[PDB]
Amino acid sequence: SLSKSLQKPTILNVETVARSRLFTVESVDLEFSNGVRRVYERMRPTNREAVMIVPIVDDHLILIREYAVGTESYELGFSKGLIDPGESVYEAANRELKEEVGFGANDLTFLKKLSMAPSYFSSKMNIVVAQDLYPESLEGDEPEPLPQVRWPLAHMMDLLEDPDFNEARNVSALFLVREWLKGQGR
Amino acid sequence: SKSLQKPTILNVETVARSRLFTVESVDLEFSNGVRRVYERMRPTNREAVMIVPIVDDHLILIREYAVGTESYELGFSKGLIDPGESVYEAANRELKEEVGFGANDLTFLKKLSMAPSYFSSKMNIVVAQDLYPESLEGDEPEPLPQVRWPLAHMMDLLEDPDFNEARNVSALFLVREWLKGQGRV
């Protein structure tokens, strides 16, 4: 038969089937274009977005060490947080830097927006590069201080040899910033 | 300056369960005495695999429905590694189920975590070459349209929002780096 365009399935029903303090899982009844019915599960859709900041000062990246309960270990990577309602990406980035690393930035650049496993989650991550930093601290919600790690741009790619850093958002960010740095040749 | 001391886990408790999700509440005591109750997805040892097939200087991508964003993604074939399978074996089987091809040359490029703050799952990236026809039945509810994308313009994928997902992006850049190594550019 004739090749045809994509046709999204119709959502027959959506029901909350489990809720924790931070998670709300929904059961979604679907009917695909070919009439096949299936029940999928996903995290309740939200429009709350995240921001990840990549600070560069004196030819070094500023990374942080942060506990992750999912793996029960310390990850090495870029500062991340949520964009509060009403805030632009630049504003959330500046606020998160101040709260996590004690600096604000006069030069913030929005490089890319990414989704993460959209089959189950609808969250987006905005990658921002921060330069021309100045000291300024804000109170965050971290239970413990976030140790900072200065990493030379010239050896940026060595971060891929550290399993504590090898997380999809960190790796995507690393390569996107390097591409951007090439643009201006710095 | 003091060394890193992981918080101590005082208590773990299942607090919600769905068909595919089991959320745990974790009581923590950081080394500075601060106490917090974090929530996470029950830790698992099960791993995923993602395959990047290359044929005649082109990437083979697939379009697949994602209920979380209620849209069609454009990207690499992904699946779960079955217990007892190596990454190579899982990659070959998934290729077969999803694109109808097996591969004689499979290379394991990288292993990545995904939001370790709440999940503990790993994603293995495998490049597949020297393909041959061979189908296996998967459990997909509808066919997965295939899209051929030239290696010479692989970075243009970053201009398609249907493709811009952290795992696809990481794999794209890692495969490009690897291609450079064989002068495939």
Side-chain angles (χ1 to χ4, degrees), chain A residues 116-161:
Chain A
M116 312 88 116
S119 275
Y120 308 97
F121 318 93
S122 60
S123 210
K124 315 287 184 212
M125 167 66 80
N126 300 271
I127 299 165
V128 176
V129 181
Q131 314 176 86
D132 187 22
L133 316 191
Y134 57 85
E136 179 179 342
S137 180
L138 249 24
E139 246 269 338
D141 306 295
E142 65 295 329
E144 65 182 352
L146 306 166
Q148 287 173 44
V149 181
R150 276 159 145 66
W151 201 283
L153 286 185
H155 297 287
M156 281 167 97
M157 302 327 284
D158 302 346
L159 281 161
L160 266 16
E161 292 299 338

mmCIF file of all heavy atoms in Angstrom, chain A residues 116-161:
data_model
loop_
_atom_site.group_PDB
_atom_site.id
_atom_site.type_symbol
_atom_site.label_atom_id
_atom_site.label_comp_id
_atom_site.label_asym_id
_atom_site.label_seq_id
_atom_site.Cartn_x
_atom_site.Cartn_y
_atom_site.Cartn_z
ATOM 1 N N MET A 116 15.305 14.708 27.812
ATOM 2 C CA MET A 116 15.998 13.540 28.358
ATOM 3 C C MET A 116 14.995 12.385 28.500
ATOM 4 O O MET A 116 14.036 12.450 29.255
ATOM 5 C CB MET A 116 16.640 13.806 29.707
ATOM 6 C CG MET A 116 17.480 15.035 29.940
ATOM 7 S SD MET A 116 16.539 16.474 30.479
ATOM 8 C CE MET A 116 17.203 16.760 32.116
ATOM 9 N N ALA A 117 15.173 11.314 27.742
ATOM 10 C CA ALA A 117 14.265 10.172 27.773
ATOM 11 C C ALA A 117 12.803 10.599 27.755
ATOM 12 O O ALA A 117 12.032 10.383 28.693
ATOM 13 C CB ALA A 117 14.583 9.269 28.958
ATOM 14 N N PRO A 118 12.360 11.194 26.641
ATOM 15 C CA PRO A 118 11.003 11.647 26.437
ATOM 16 C C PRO A 118 9.956 10.559 26.405
ATOM 17 O O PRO A 118 8.743 10.817 26.388
ATOM 18 C CB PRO A 118 11.049 12.431 25.130
ATOM 19 C CG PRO A 118 12.243 11.907 24.410
ATOM 20 C CD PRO A 118 13.228 11.514 25.479
ATOM 21 N N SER A 119 10.333 9.285 26.393
ATOM 22 C CA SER A 119 9.360 8.195 26.422
ATOM 23 C C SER A 119 8.661 8.154 27.780
ATOM 24 O O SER A 119 7.506 7.761 27.869
ATOM 25 C CB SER A 119 10.046 6.846 26.172
ATOM 26 O OG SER A 119 10.175 6.613 24.779
ATOM 27 N N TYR A 120 9.368 8.519 28.842
ATOM 28 C CA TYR A 120 8.868 8.531 30.194
ATOM 29 C C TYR A 120 8.815 9.893 30.853
ATOM 30 O O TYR A 120 8.070 10.076 31.822
ATOM 31 C CB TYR A 120 9.762 7.618 31.086
ATOM 32 C CG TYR A 120 9.898 6.243 30.458
ATOM 33 C CD1 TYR A 120 11.009 5.939 29.685
ATOM 34 C CD2 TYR A 120 8.886 5.305 30.569
ATOM 35 C CE1 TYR A 120 11.126 4.707 29.066
ATOM 36 C CE2 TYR A 120 8.998 4.069 29.959
ATOM 37 C CZ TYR A 120 10.115 3.780 29.207
ATOM 38 O OH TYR A 120 10.238 2.555 28.594
ATOM 39 N N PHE A 121 9.643 10.846 30.428
ATOM 40 C CA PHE A 121 9.670 12.171 31.045
ATOM 41 C C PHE A 121 9.554 13.268 29.995
ATOM 42 O O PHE A 121 10.051 13.096 28.873
ATOM 43 C CB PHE A 121 10.978 12.404 31.823
ATOM 44 C CG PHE A 121 11.438 11.228 32.638
ATOM 45 C CD1 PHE A 121 12.331 10.312 32.101
ATOM 46 C CD2 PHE A 121 10.956 11.014 33.917
ATOM 47 C CE1 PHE A 121 12.747 9.211 32.833
ATOM 48 C CE2 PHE A 121 11.366 9.916 34.649
ATOM 49 C CZ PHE A 121 12.256 9.011 34.105
ATOM 50 N N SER A 122 9.011 14.415 30.359
ATOM 51 C CA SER A 122 8.888 15.516 29.407
ATOM 52 C C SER A 122 9.802 16.685 29.762
ATOM 53 O O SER A 122 9.709 17.757 29.139
ATOM 54 C CB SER A 122 7.429 16.005 29.402
ATOM 55 O OG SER A 122 7.095 16.449 30.716
ATOM 56 N N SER A 123 10.702 16.522 30.714
ATOM 57 C CA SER A 123 11.583 17.602 31.128
ATOM 58 C C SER A 123 12.628 18.040 30.114
ATOM 59 O O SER A 123 13.206 17.241 29.398
ATOM 60 C CB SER A 123 12.306 17.212 32.437
ATOM 61 O OG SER A 123 12.563 18.409 33.164
ATOM 62 N N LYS A 124 12.928 19.332 30.087
ATOM 63 C CA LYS A 124 13.902 19.928 29.215
ATOM 64 C C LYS A 124 15.055 20.516 30.054
ATOM 65 O O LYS A 124 14.812 21.083 31.117
ATOM 66 C CB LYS A 124 13.382 21.106 28.390
ATOM 67 C CG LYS A 124 12.045 20.956 27.725
ATOM 68 C CD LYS A 124 12.098 20.023 26.531
ATOM 69 C CE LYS A 124 10.728 20.000 25.841
ATOM 70 N NZ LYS A 124 10.489 18.655 25.249
ATOM 71 N N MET A 125 16.224 20.488 29.432
ATOM 72 C CA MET A 125 17.422 21.025 30.069
ATOM 73 C C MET A 125 18.040 22.107 29.198
ATOM 74 O O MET A 125 18.360 21.893 28.025
ATOM 75 C CB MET A 125 18.372 19.878 30.364
ATOM 76 C CG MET A 125 19.794 20.281 30.743
ATOM 77 S SD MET A 125 19.840 21.148 32.310
ATOM 78 C CE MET A 125 19.743 19.786 33.467
ATOM 79 N N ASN A 126 18.205 23.301 29.750
ATOM 80 C CA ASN A 126 18.797 24.404 29.001
ATOM 81 C C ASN A 126 20.268 24.540 29.389
ATOM 82 O O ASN A 126 20.566 24.674 30.583
ATOM 83 C CB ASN A 126 18.051 25.724 29.255
ATOM 84 C CG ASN A 126 16.583 25.640 28.851
ATOM 85 O OD1 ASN A 126 16.233 25.906 27.714
ATOM 86 N ND2 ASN A 126 15.717 25.235 29.781
ATOM 87 N N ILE A 127 21.149 24.471 28.395
ATOM 88 C CA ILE A 127 22.584 24.596 28.634
ATOM 89 C C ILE A 127 23.056 26.021 28.448
ATOM 90 O O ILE A 127 22.879 26.656 27.397
ATOM 91 C CB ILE A 127 23.375 23.647 27.696
ATOM 92 C CG1 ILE A 127 22.958 22.199 28.003
ATOM 93 C CG2 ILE A 127 24.868 23.828 27.889
ATOM 94 C CD1 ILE A 127 23.376 21.210 26.927
ATOM 95 N N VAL A 128 23.634 26.605 29.494
ATOM 96 C CA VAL A 128 24.107 27.986 29.413
ATOM 97 C C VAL A 128 25.598 28.092 29.725
ATOM 98 O O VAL A 128 26.045 27.452 30.682
ATOM 99 C CB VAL A 128 23.334 28.856 30.434
ATOM 100 C CG1 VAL A 128 23.854 30.287 30.461
ATOM 101 C CG2 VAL A 128 21.842 28.856 30.179
ATOM 102 N N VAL A 129 26.334 28.919 28.994
ATOM 103 C CA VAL A 129 27.764 29.121 29.285
ATOM 104 C C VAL A 129 27.896 30.459 30.027
ATOM 105 O O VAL A 129 27.282 31.439 29.606
ATOM 106 C CB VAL A 129 28.625 29.194 28.015
ATOM 107 C CG1 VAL A 129 30.116 29.371 28.353
ATOM 108 C CG2 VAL A 129 28.420 27.956 27.174
ATOM 109 N N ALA A 130 28.618 30.468 31.129
ATOM 110 C CA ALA A 130 28.837 31.630 31.956
ATOM 111 C C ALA A 130 30.289 32.113 31.936
ATOM 112 O O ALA A 130 31.207 31.316 32.210
ATOM 113 C CB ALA A 130 28.554 31.265 33.419
ATOM 114 N N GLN A 131 30.501 33.358 31.564
ATOM 115 C CA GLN A 131 31.824 33.965 31.538
ATOM 116 C C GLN A 131 31.754 35.347 32.203
ATOM 117 O O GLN A 131 30.670 35.910 32.361
ATOM 118 C CB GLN A 131 32.382 34.146 30.134
ATOM 119 C CG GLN A 131 32.245 32.950 29.227
ATOM 120 C CD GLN A 131 32.715 33.214 27.815
ATOM 121 O OE1 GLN A 131 33.902 33.070 27.533
ATOM 122 N NE2 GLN A 131 31.801 33.609 26.946
ATOM 123 N N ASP A 132 32.923 35.916 32.450
ATOM 124 C CA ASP A 132 33.065 37.216 33.082
ATOM 125 C C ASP A 132 32.345 37.191 34.427
ATOM 126 O O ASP A 132 31.352 37.876 34.674
ATOM 127 C CB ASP A 132 32.582 38.342 32.181
ATOM 128 C CG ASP A 132 32.907 39.705 32.806
ATOM 129 O OD1 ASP A 132 33.821 39.757 33.660
ATOM 130 O OD2 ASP A 132 32.231 40.687 32.474
ATOM 131 N N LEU A 133 32.857 36.332 35.304
ATOM 132 C CA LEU A 133 32.299 36.117 36.623
ATOM 133 C C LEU A 133 32.744 37.150 37.655
ATOM 134 O O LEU A 133 33.818 37.715 37.555
ATOM 135 C CB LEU A 133 32.716 34.738 37.157
ATOM 136 C CG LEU A 133 32.650 33.542 36.228
ATOM 137 C CD1 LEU A 133 32.847 32.242 37.016
ATOM 138 C CD2 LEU A 133 31.338 33.475 35.460
ATOM 139 N N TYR A 134 31.923 37.304 38.682
ATOM 140 C CA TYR A 134 32.192 38.223 39.782
ATOM 141 C C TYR A 134 31.623 37.556 41.043
ATOM 142 O O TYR A 134 30.637 36.822 40.927
ATOM 143 C CB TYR A 134 31.551 39.595 39.566
ATOM 144 C CG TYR A 134 30.057 39.522 39.352
ATOM 145 C CD1 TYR A 134 29.168 39.494 40.406
ATOM 146 C CD2 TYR A 134 29.543 39.421 38.059
ATOM 147 C CE1 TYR A 134 27.794 39.399 40.192
ATOM 148 C CE2 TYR A 134 28.182 39.335 37.832
ATOM 149 C CZ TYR A 134 27.316 39.324 38.904
ATOM 150 O OH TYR A 134 25.955 39.229 38.670
ATOM 151 N N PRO A 135 32.279 37.753 42.173
ATOM 152 C CA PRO A 135 31.852 37.187 43.432
ATOM 153 C C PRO A 135 30.502 37.707 43.890
ATOM 154 O O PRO A 135 30.238 38.910 43.918
ATOM 155 C CB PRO A 135 32.930 37.589 44.438
ATOM 156 C CG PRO A 135 34.038 38.194 43.658
ATOM 157 C CD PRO A 135 33.482 38.603 42.319
ATOM 158 N N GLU A 136 29.610 36.804 44.248
ATOM 159 C CA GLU A 136 28.280 37.127 44.740
ATOM 160 C C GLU A 136 27.626 35.792 45.132
ATOM 161 O O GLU A 136 27.475 34.901 44.302
ATOM 162 C CB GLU A 136 27.356 37.880 43.812
ATOM 163 C CG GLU A 136 25.993 38.131 44.444
ATOM 164 C CD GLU A 136 25.020 38.906 43.594
ATOM 165 O OE1 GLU A 136 25.420 39.582 42.627
ATOM 166 O OE2 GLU A 136 23.798 38.870 43.886
ATOM 167 N N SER A 137 27.238 35.723 46.386
ATOM 168 C CA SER A 137 26.674 34.505 46.928
ATOM 169 C C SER A 137 25.217 34.618 47.295
ATOM 170 O O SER A 137 24.724 35.689 47.644
ATOM 171 C CB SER A 137 27.552 34.132 48.146
ATOM 172 O OG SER A 137 27.086 32.957 48.748
ATOM 173 N N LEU A 138 24.498 33.530 47.115
ATOM 174 C CA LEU A 138 23.075 33.421 47.424
ATOM 175 C C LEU A 138 22.882 32.084 48.166
ATOM 176 O O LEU A 138 23.676 31.156 47.956
ATOM 177 C CB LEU A 138 22.214 33.460 46.189
ATOM 178 C CG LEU A 138 21.284 34.594 45.830
ATOM 179 C CD1 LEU A 138 21.639 35.946 46.427
ATOM 180 C CD2 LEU A 138 21.188 34.754 44.302
ATOM 181 N N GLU A 139 21.874 32.008 49.003
ATOM 182 C CA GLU A 139 21.557 30.828 49.781
ATOM 183 C C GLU A 139 20.826 29.782 48.949
ATOM 184 O O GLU A 139 19.724 30.015 48.466
ATOM 185 C CB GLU A 139 20.673 31.195 50.984
ATOM 186 C CG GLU A 139 21.320 31.006 52.339
ATOM 187 C CD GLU A 139 21.081 29.629 52.933
ATOM 188 O OE1 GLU A 139 20.102 28.948 52.545
ATOM 189 O OE2 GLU A 139 21.875 29.212 53.804
ATOM 190 N N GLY A 140 21.447 28.609 48.804
ATOM 191 C CA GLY A 140 20.802 27.542 48.030
ATOM 192 C C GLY A 140 20.182 26.534 48.994
ATOM 193 O O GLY A 140 20.170 26.781 50.195
ATOM 194 N N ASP A 141 19.715 25.404 48.475
ATOM 195 C CA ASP A 141 19.108 24.390 49.324
ATOM 196 C C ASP A 141 19.977 23.156 49.524
ATOM 197 O O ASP A 141 19.471 22.154 50.057
ATOM 198 C CB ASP A 141 17.746 23.936 48.755
ATOM 199 C CG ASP A 141 16.834 25.125 48.511
ATOM 200 O OD1 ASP A 141 16.460 25.783 49.503
ATOM 201 O OD2 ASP A 141 16.527 25.408 47.332
ATOM 202 N N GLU A 142 21.223 23.190 49.084
ATOM 203 C CA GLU A 142 22.114 22.053 49.255
ATOM 204 C C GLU A 142 22.390 21.775 50.731
ATOM 205 O O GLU A 142 22.622 22.663 51.541
ATOM 206 C CB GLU A 142 23.421 22.237 48.494
ATOM 207 C CG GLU A 142 24.347 23.336 48.921
ATOM 208 C CD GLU A 142 23.806 24.743 48.738
ATOM 209 O OE1 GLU A 142 23.009 24.991 47.807
ATOM 210 O OE2 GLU A 142 24.189 25.623 49.533
ATOM 211 N N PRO A 143 22.406 20.489 51.085
ATOM 212 C CA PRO A 143 22.665 20.061 52.446
ATOM 213 C C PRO A 143 24.136 20.181 52.798
ATOM 214 O O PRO A 143 24.495 20.210 53.966
ATOM 215 C CB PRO A 143 22.208 18.616 52.475
ATOM 216 C CG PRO A 143 22.267 18.139 51.071
ATOM 217 C CD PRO A 143 22.115 19.349 50.185
ATOM 218 N N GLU A 144 25.005 20.161 51.781
ATOM 219 C CA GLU A 144 26.440 20.270 52.070
ATOM 220 C C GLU A 144 27.086 21.077 50.960
ATOM 221 O O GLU A 144 26.510 21.184 49.878
ATOM 222 C CB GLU A 144 27.083 18.894 52.248
ATOM 223 C CG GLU A 144 27.110 18.018 51.029
ATOM 224 C CD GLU A 144 27.687 16.634 51.151
ATOM 225 O OE1 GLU A 144 28.287 16.206 52.165
ATOM 226 O OE2 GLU A 144 27.533 15.882 50.151
ATOM 227 N N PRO A 145 28.217 21.692 51.240
ATOM 228 C CA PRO A 145 28.931 22.478 50.255
ATOM 229 C C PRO A 145 29.299 21.651 49.028
ATOM 230 O O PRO A 145 29.452 20.425 49.093
ATOM 231 C CB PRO A 145 30.167 22.985 50.987
ATOM 232 C CG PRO A 145 29.924 22.756 52.435
ATOM 233 C CD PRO A 145 28.935 21.629 52.537
ATOM 234 N N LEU A 146 29.355 22.288 47.872
ATOM 235 C CA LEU A 146 29.712 21.633 46.618
ATOM 236 C C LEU A 146 31.152 21.958 46.252
ATOM 237 O O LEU A 146 31.455 23.086 45.850
ATOM 238 C CB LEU A 146 28.746 22.124 45.524
ATOM 239 C CG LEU A 146 27.265 21.950 45.887
ATOM 240 C CD1 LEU A 146 26.355 22.745 44.967
ATOM 241 C CD2 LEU A 146 26.891 20.470 45.881
ATOM 242 N N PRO A 147 32.062 21.026 46.451
ATOM 243 C CA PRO A 147 33.469 21.264 46.147
ATOM 244 C C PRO A 147 33.610 21.605 44.668
ATOM 245 O O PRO A 147 32.925 21.004 43.839
ATOM 246 C CB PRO A 147 34.184 19.977 46.518
ATOM 247 C CG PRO A 147 33.240 19.217 47.369
ATOM 248 C CD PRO A 147 31.842 19.665 46.963
ATOM 249 N N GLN A 148 34.412 22.612 44.373
ATOM 250 C CA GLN A 148 34.675 23.084 43.037
ATOM 251 C C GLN A 148 35.941 22.471 42.463
ATOM 252 O O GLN A 148 36.882 22.129 43.186
ATOM 253 C CB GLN A 148 34.822 24.627 43.036
ATOM 254 C CG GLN A 148 33.494 25.323 43.233
ATOM 255 C CD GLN A 148 33.584 26.814 43.411
ATOM 256 O OE1 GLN A 148 34.320 27.481 42.694
ATOM 257 N NE2 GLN A 148 32.804 27.351 44.355
ATOM 258 N N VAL A 149 35.921 22.210 41.159
ATOM 259 C CA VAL A 149 37.078 21.651 40.464
ATOM 260 C C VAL A 149 37.379 22.491 39.215
ATOM 261 O O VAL A 149 36.502 22.659 38.350
ATOM 262 C CB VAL A 149 36.896 20.192 40.044
ATOM 263 C CG1 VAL A 149 38.168 19.673 39.348
ATOM 264 C CG2 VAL A 149 36.572 19.284 41.221
ATOM 265 N N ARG A 150 38.562 23.070 39.157
ATOM 266 C CA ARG A 150 38.981 23.854 37.997
ATOM 267 C C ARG A 150 39.597 22.889 36.973
ATOM 268 O O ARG A 150 40.473 22.101 37.328
ATOM 269 C CB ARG A 150 39.967 24.952 38.410
ATOM 270 C CG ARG A 150 39.202 26.178 38.917
ATOM 271 C CD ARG A 150 40.070 27.062 39.801
ATOM 272 N NE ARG A 150 39.725 28.471 39.600
ATOM 273 C CZ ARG A 150 38.574 29.043 39.923
ATOM 274 N NH1 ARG A 150 37.593 28.351 40.491
ATOM 275 N NH2 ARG A 150 38.400 30.332 39.667
ATOM 276 N N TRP A 151 39.071 22.891 35.766
ATOM 277 C CA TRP A 151 39.510 21.988 34.713
ATOM 278 C C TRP A 151 39.877 22.772 33.460
ATOM 279 O O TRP A 151 39.037 23.484 32.912
ATOM 280 C CB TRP A 151 38.366 21.007 34.397
ATOM 281 C CG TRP A 151 38.854 19.762 33.721
ATOM 282 C CD1 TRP A 151 39.229 19.614 32.409
ATOM 283 C CD2 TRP A 151 38.993 18.477 34.339
ATOM 284 N NE1 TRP A 151 39.604 18.312 32.172
ATOM 285 C CE2 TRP A 151 39.459 17.594 33.346
ATOM 286 C CE3 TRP A 151 38.760 17.996 35.632
ATOM 287 C CZ2 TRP A 151 39.714 16.247 33.620
ATOM 288 C CZ3 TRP A 151 39.010 16.656 35.916
ATOM 289 C CH2 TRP A 151 39.494 15.805 34.892
ATOM 290 N N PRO A 152 41.122 22.636 33.024
ATOM 291 C CA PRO A 152 41.611 23.377 31.888
ATOM 292 C C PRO A 152 40.870 23.060 30.605
ATOM 293 O O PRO A 152 40.696 21.895 30.254
ATOM 294 C CB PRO A 152 43.081 23.031 31.788
ATOM 295 C CG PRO A 152 43.400 22.069 32.856
ATOM 296 C CD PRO A 152 42.160 21.796 33.656
ATOM 297 N N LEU A 153 40.529 24.111 29.858
ATOM 298 C CA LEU A 153 39.837 23.967 28.587
ATOM 299 C C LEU A 153 40.656 23.137 27.609
ATOM 300 O O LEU A 153 40.123 22.313 26.860
ATOM 301 C CB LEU A 153 39.631 25.352 27.927
ATOM 302 C CG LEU A 153 38.566 26.256 28.544
ATOM 303 C CD1 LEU A 153 38.407 27.529 27.707
ATOM 304 C CD2 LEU A 153 37.241 25.531 28.660
ATOM 305 N N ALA A 154 41.965 23.374 27.620
ATOM 306 C CA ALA A 154 42.910 22.688 26.760
ATOM 307 C C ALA A 154 42.879 21.181 26.954
ATOM 308 O O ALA A 154 43.261 20.448 26.036
ATOM 309 C CB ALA A 154 44.330 23.245 26.969
ATOM 310 N N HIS A 155 42.400 20.679 28.082
ATOM 311 C CA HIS A 155 42.289 19.251 28.342
ATOM 312 C C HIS A 155 40.865 18.863 28.715
ATOM 313 O O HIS A 155 40.617 17.818 29.333
ATOM 314 C CB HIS A 155 43.255 18.837 29.484
ATOM 315 C CG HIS A 155 44.678 19.084 29.046
ATOM 316 N ND1 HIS A 155 45.285 18.279 28.103
ATOM 317 C CD2 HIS A 155 45.550 20.075 29.343
ATOM 318 C CE1 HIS A 155 46.497 18.748 27.867
ATOM 319 N NE2 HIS A 155 46.689 19.829 28.607
ATOM 320 N N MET A 156 39.896 19.646 28.271
ATOM 321 C CA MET A 156 38.483 19.447 28.520
ATOM 322 C C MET A 156 38.017 17.999 28.254
ATOM 323 O O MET A 156 37.166 17.498 28.965
ATOM 324 C CB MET A 156 37.624 20.215 27.525
ATOM 325 C CG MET A 156 37.303 21.641 27.561
ATOM 326 S SD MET A 156 36.585 22.115 25.951
ATOM 327 C CE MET A 156 34.844 22.009 26.406
ATOM 328 N N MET A 157 38.386 17.477 27.077
ATOM 329 C CA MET A 157 38.015 16.140 26.675
ATOM 330 C C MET A 157 38.526 15.079 27.615
ATOM 331 O O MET A 157 37.931 13.986 27.627
ATOM 332 C CB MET A 157 38.377 15.858 25.202
ATOM 333 C CG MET A 157 37.726 16.847 24.222
ATOM 334 S SD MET A 157 36.088 17.460 24.719
ATOM 335 C CE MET A 157 35.064 16.060 24.344
ATOM 336 N N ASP A 158 39.523 15.323 28.480
ATOM 337 C CA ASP A 158 39.947 14.281 29.423
ATOM 338 C C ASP A 158 38.818 13.942 30.399
ATOM 339 O O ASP A 158 38.855 12.874 31.044
ATOM 340 C CB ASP A 158 41.171 14.682 30.226
ATOM 341 C CG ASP A 158 42.406 15.036 29.445
ATOM 342 O OD1 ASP A 158 42.470 14.732 28.238
ATOM 343 O OD2 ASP A 158 43.331 15.644 30.031
ATOM 344 N N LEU A 159 37.807 14.802 30.570
ATOM 345 C CA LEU A 159 36.710 14.515 31.491
ATOM 346 C C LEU A 159 35.975 13.220 31.155
ATOM 347 O O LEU A 159 35.381 12.573 32.026
ATOM 348 C CB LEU A 159 35.709 15.677 31.536
ATOM 349 C CG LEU A 159 36.125 16.885 32.406
ATOM 350 C CD1 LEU A 159 35.329 18.113 32.017
ATOM 351 C CD2 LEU A 159 35.960 16.558 33.890
ATOM 352 N N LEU A 160 36.032 12.776 29.908
ATOM 353 C CA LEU A 160 35.440 11.553 29.410
ATOM 354 C C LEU A 160 36.125 10.299 29.932
ATOM 355 O O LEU A 160 35.672 9.183 29.624
ATOM 356 C CB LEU A 160 35.524 11.553 27.867
ATOM 357 C CG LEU A 160 34.345 12.076 27.066
ATOM 358 C CD1 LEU A 160 33.357 12.887 27.869
ATOM 359 C CD2 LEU A 160 34.806 12.832 25.821
ATOM 360 N N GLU A 161 37.250 10.438 30.635
ATOM 361 C CA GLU A 161 37.943 9.300 31.221
ATOM 362 C C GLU A 161 37.532 9.153 32.684
ATOM 363 O O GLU A 161 37.974 8.250 33.397
ATOM 364 C CB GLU A 161 39.457 9.416 31.089
ATOM 365 C CG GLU A 161 39.947 9.292 29.644
ATOM 366 C CD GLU A 161 39.596 7.944 29.042
ATOM 367 O OE1 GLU A 161 39.364 6.964 29.794
ATOM 368 O OE2 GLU A 161 39.537 7.836 27.805
#
